[PDB]
Coordinates of C-alpha atoms and ligand atoms in Angstrom, one line a residue:
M117 CA -13.5 -2.8 19.1
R118 CA -12.2 -6.0 17.2
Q119 CA -8.8 -7.5 17.9
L120 CA -7.1 -6.8 14.9
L121 CA -6.9 -4.5 12.0
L122 CA -5.5 -6.3 8.7
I123 CA -3.8 -4.2 6.3
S124 CA -2.9 -5.8 3.1
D125 CA -1.6 -5.4 -0.7
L126 CA -3.6 -7.3 -3.2
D127 CA -1.0 -8.1 -6.1
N128 CA 1.7 -10.7 -4.9
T129 CA 1.1 -10.5 -2.0
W130 CA -3.1 -11.6 -1.3
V131 CA -3.4 -12.3 -4.6
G132 CA -1.0 -14.6 -6.9
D133 CA -1.4 -17.9 -5.7
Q134 CA -5.3 -18.5 -5.1
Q135 CA -5.0 -21.8 -3.0
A136 CA -3.6 -19.9 -0.7
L137 CA -6.1 -17.0 -1.0
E138 CA -8.5 -19.0 -0.6
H139 CA -7.6 -21.0 2.8
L140 CA -7.1 -17.6 4.3
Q141 CA -10.1 -16.3 3.4
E142 CA -12.0 -19.7 4.8
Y143 CA -10.1 -19.0 8.1
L144 CA -11.1 -15.7 8.0
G145 CA -13.8 -15.9 7.0
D146 CA -14.9 -18.4 10.1
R147 CA -14.5 -15.4 12.3
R148 CA -15.1 -12.4 10.4
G149 CA -16.5 -10.5 13.1
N150 CA -13.1 -10.6 15.2
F151 CA -10.7 -8.1 12.2
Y152 CA -11.3 -5.0 10.7
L153 CA -10.2 -6.0 6.9
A154 CA -8.4 -3.0 4.4
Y155 CA -6.9 -3.6 1.0
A156 CA -3.7 -0.7 0.8
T157 CA -3.5 -1.4 -3.1
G158 CA -1.3 0.8 -5.8
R159 CA -4.7 0.2 -7.9
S160 CA -7.0 2.6 -8.7
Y161 CA -10.7 1.3 -6.7
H162 CA -12.2 0.1 -9.9
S163 CA -9.1 -1.7 -10.9
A164 CA -9.0 -3.0 -7.1
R165 CA -13.1 -3.9 -7.8
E166 CA -12.4 -5.7 -10.7
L167 CA -9.8 -7.7 -9.3
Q168 CA -12.1 -8.6 -6.9
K169 CA -14.2 -10.2 -9.5
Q170 CA -11.8 -12.1 -11.0
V171 CA -10.3 -13.7 -7.7
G172 CA -13.1 -13.5 -5.2
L173 CA -11.5 -11.3 -2.6
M174 CA -13.6 -11.5 0.3
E175 CA -15.0 -8.4 0.9
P176 CA -12.9 -5.4 3.4
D177 CA -14.4 -3.1 5.3
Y178 CA -12.1 -0.6 3.9
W179 CA -10.0 0.2 0.4
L180 CA -7.0 2.2 0.7
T181 CA -6.9 2.8 -3.1
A182 CA -4.1 3.7 -5.5
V183 CA -1.0 4.1 -2.6
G184 CA -3.3 5.0 -0.5
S185 CA -4.4 8.8 -2.2
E186 CA -7.6 7.7 -1.9
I187 CA -9.3 5.7 0.7
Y188 CA -13.0 4.5 0.4
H189 CA -15.6 4.0 3.4
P190 CA -18.5 1.2 3.1
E191 CA -20.4 4.4 2.4
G192 CA -17.9 5.7 -0.1
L193 CA -15.1 7.9 -1.1
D194 CA -13.5 10.0 2.2
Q195 CA -14.2 13.5 2.1
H196 CA -12.0 14.9 4.6
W197 CA -8.7 12.2 3.7
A198 CA -9.2 14.2 0.2
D199 CA -9.2 17.6 1.4
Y200 CA -6.0 17.2 3.8
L201 CA -4.0 15.4 0.5
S202 CA -4.9 18.4 -1.6
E203 CA -3.6 20.8 0.9
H204 CA 0.0 22.5 -0.2
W205 CA -0.5 20.0 -3.1
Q206 CA 0.6 20.9 -6.8
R207 CA 0.2 18.3 -9.1
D208 CA 0.6 20.7 -12.5
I209 CA 4.5 21.7 -11.1
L210 CA 5.1 18.2 -9.6
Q211 CA 4.4 16.8 -13.2
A212 CA 5.9 19.1 -15.4
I213 CA 9.1 18.2 -14.1
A214 CA 9.0 14.9 -14.4
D215 CA 7.7 15.1 -17.7
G216 CA 10.5 16.2 -18.4
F217 CA 12.9 13.0 -17.6
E218 CA 13.6 11.4 -20.6
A219 CA 13.9 8.0 -18.4
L220 CA 10.3 8.2 -17.8
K221 CA 7.5 7.7 -19.5
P222 CA 3.9 8.4 -17.9
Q223 CA 1.4 5.5 -17.0
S224 CA -1.6 5.4 -18.9
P225 CA -4.5 8.0 -17.3
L226 CA -6.5 6.2 -15.9
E227 CA -3.6 5.1 -13.1
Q228 CA -3.9 8.8 -12.6
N229 CA -5.8 11.2 -9.5
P230 CA -5.4 14.4 -8.4
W231 CA -3.2 13.2 -5.9
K232 CA -1.2 10.9 -8.1
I233 CA 1.7 10.9 -10.8
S234 CA 2.8 8.1 -12.1
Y235 CA 5.2 6.8 -14.8
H236 CA 7.9 3.5 -15.3
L237 CA 11.2 3.8 -15.2
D238 CA 13.1 3.0 -18.8
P239 CA 14.7 -0.4 -17.9
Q240 CA 17.6 0.5 -19.8
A241 CA 17.8 3.8 -18.1
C242 CA 19.7 3.7 -14.4
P243 CA 17.3 3.5 -11.3
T244 CA 20.0 6.6 -10.3
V245 CA 17.9 8.6 -12.0
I246 CA 15.3 8.0 -9.6
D247 CA 17.6 10.0 -6.9
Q248 CA 17.7 12.9 -9.4
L249 CA 14.2 12.9 -9.2
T250 CA 13.5 12.5 -5.6
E251 CA 15.7 15.6 -5.1
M252 CA 14.4 18.0 -7.3
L253 CA 10.8 17.8 -6.6
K254 CA 11.7 17.9 -3.3
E255 CA 13.6 21.2 -3.9
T256 CA 10.0 22.8 -5.3
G257 CA 8.8 22.9 -1.3
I258 CA 6.4 21.3 -2.7
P259 CA 5.3 18.8 0.5
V260 CA 5.7 15.5 -2.2
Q261 CA 6.9 11.9 -1.7
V262 CA 8.6 9.3 -4.3
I263 CA 7.9 5.2 -4.6
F264 CA 9.1 2.8 -6.1
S265 CA 8.8 -0.1 -6.7
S266 CA 9.3 -3.3 -8.7
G267 CA 12.1 -1.5 -10.4
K268 CA 10.0 0.2 -12.6
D269 CA 6.8 2.1 -11.0
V270 CA 7.0 5.7 -10.0
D271 CA 4.7 7.5 -8.3
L272 CA 4.4 11.2 -7.0
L273 CA 2.2 11.9 -4.2
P274 CA 1.7 13.8 -1.7
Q275 CA 3.3 13.4 1.8
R276 CA 0.9 13.5 3.6
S277 CA -0.2 10.2 1.7
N278 CA 1.2 6.3 1.0
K279 CA -0.1 3.4 2.3
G280 CA 1.2 3.6 5.7
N281 CA -0.4 7.1 6.8
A282 CA -3.4 6.4 5.3
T283 CA -3.5 3.1 7.3
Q284 CA -2.3 5.5 10.5
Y285 CA -5.6 7.6 9.8
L286 CA -7.1 4.4 9.7
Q287 CA -6.4 3.2 12.9
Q288 CA -7.2 6.5 14.7
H289 CA -10.4 6.6 12.8
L290 CA -11.4 3.4 14.2
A291 CA -9.5 4.0 17.4
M292 CA -6.8 0.9 16.8
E293 CA -3.5 -0.1 18.0
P294 CA -0.3 -0.1 16.6
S295 CA -0.3 -3.6 18.3
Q296 CA -3.5 -4.3 16.9
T297 CA -2.4 -4.2 13.4
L298 CA -1.2 -6.4 10.5
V299 CA 0.5 -4.7 7.6
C300 CA 1.3 -7.4 4.4
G301 CA 3.1 -6.1 1.6
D302 CA 4.9 -7.5 -1.2
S303 CA 7.3 -4.3 -2.7
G304 CA 8.2 -0.3 -2.7
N305 CA 5.2 0.8 -2.6
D306 CA 4.5 -0.8 1.1
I307 CA 7.8 1.0 3.2
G308 CA 5.2 3.2 4.3
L309 CA 3.4 0.4 5.9
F310 CA 6.4 -1.3 7.4
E311 CA 7.1 2.6 8.4
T312 CA 4.5 2.2 10.4
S313 CA 4.6 1.0 14.6
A314 CA 1.8 -1.9 12.9
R315 CA 3.3 -5.4 13.5
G316 CA 4.5 -6.4 9.5
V317 CA 5.1 -9.3 7.7
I318 CA 7.3 -9.0 4.4
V319 CA 6.1 -12.1 1.8
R320 CA 8.9 -14.6 0.8
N321 CA 8.0 -14.2 -2.5
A322 CA 8.6 -9.7 -2.0
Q323 CA 10.7 -7.7 -4.2
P324 CA 14.4 -6.5 -4.2
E325 CA 13.8 -2.9 -2.6
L326 CA 11.5 -4.2 0.4
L327 CA 13.8 -7.1 1.2
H328 CA 17.1 -4.5 1.0
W329 CA 15.1 -2.1 3.3
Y330 CA 14.0 -4.5 5.8
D331 CA 17.6 -5.5 5.9
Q332 CA 18.5 -1.6 7.3
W333 CA 15.6 -1.2 8.9
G334 CA 13.7 -4.0 9.6
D335 CA 13.0 -4.5 13.5
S336 CA 11.2 -7.0 15.8
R337 CA 8.3 -6.0 14.7
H338 CA 8.8 -6.9 11.2
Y339 CA 8.8 -10.9 10.3
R340 CA 10.4 -11.7 7.3
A341 CA 7.4 -14.7 6.1
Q342 CA 8.9 -18.3 4.5
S343 CA 5.8 -18.7 2.9
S344 CA 4.9 -16.2 0.0
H345 CA 1.5 -14.5 -1.5
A346 CA -1.4 -15.4 1.3
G347 CA 0.4 -18.6 3.3
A348 CA 2.5 -15.3 4.5
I349 CA -0.9 -13.8 6.2
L350 CA -2.0 -17.1 7.8
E351 CA 2.3 -17.4 8.9
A352 CA 2.4 -14.2 10.1
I353 CA -1.3 -14.4 12.1
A354 CA -0.2 -17.7 13.7
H355 CA 3.7 -15.6 14.2
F356 CA 1.8 -12.5 16.0
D357 CA -0.4 -14.4 17.8
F358 CA -3.2 -12.6 16.3
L359 CA -7.3 -13.8 16.7
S360 CA -5.7 -15.9 19.8
Ligands
LIG420 O1 2.6 1.6 -6.8 C1 3.3 0.8 -8.0 C2 2.1 0.6 -9.1 O2 0.9 -0.5 -8.9 C3 0.2 -0.7 -9.5 O3 -1.0 -1.3 -9.9 C4 -0.4 -2.9 -9.6 C5 -1.2 -3.0 -11.4 O4 -2.2 -1.9 -12.2 C6 -1.4 -4.5 -11.3 O5 -2.2 -4.6 -13.3 C7 -0.1 -5.3 -11.0 O6 0.4 -5.6 -11.8 O7 0.2 -5.1 -10.1 C8 0.5 -4.3 -10.0 C9 1.5 -3.2 -8.5 O8 1.0 -4.5 -7.5 C10 -0.6 0.7 -10.4 O9 -1.8 0.2 -11.1 C11 0.5 1.7 -10.8 O10 -0.1 2.6 -11.3 C12 1.2 1.9 -9.9 O11 2.7 2.5 -10.5
MG421 MG1 3.6 -3.6 -3.9

């Protein structure tokens, strides 16, 4: 029932340039009832809440955390989403396989959840290892997808997950059209966002893998902003003529 569904990553997207974050929130703060806001972050819910206190993030309507593996409504965790993601998912088998790659080191326990297995790729290792990992995991027949970003972060998620799928679920939940949706990102864990039919903005300070993705799959609905961080969001809103 609103004119815009705004979905944005936090680190290096909404966050990173405090001045830009502040004028973006001031602008949005004057028409809060005109849009639904959702933060689609790689961070856990707790970590995202902590970031909110650190930089003064405005309260979103929804939180799509841990790369969309968990969705929080104003009322709490979305149990339907969790069950949907649990179907056919085999965390232990996938973990056993990933744990076997010497170039991969587990990320801290607090970065893990039932539907998210994360690692850090050795800076000295060849990125090609990610391709080998992906193929090996896929061949298990378990519906899994590999998210590689910033040249170091590796996330194993159910195929039904990732920011894009979480976004489409939210769109359906809110009866919001892709044409009324704007997704904002900066890295590989945002590619799922641009795979959707929503309008999208890639921040100027975007990571190499996202820029590479844009050069190959970039369409008319995708916008390469001149501004970095939060400034790219205001720029995109004007570009797509949202909140007319
Ligand atoms: O999906 C990629 C990784 O994202 C991580 O979010 C963080 C991190 O927690 C922050 O401290 C800051 O550095 O930005 C990162 C990128 O957004 C998440 O914690 C990892 O588990 C993910 O693999
Ligand atoms: Mg990102």
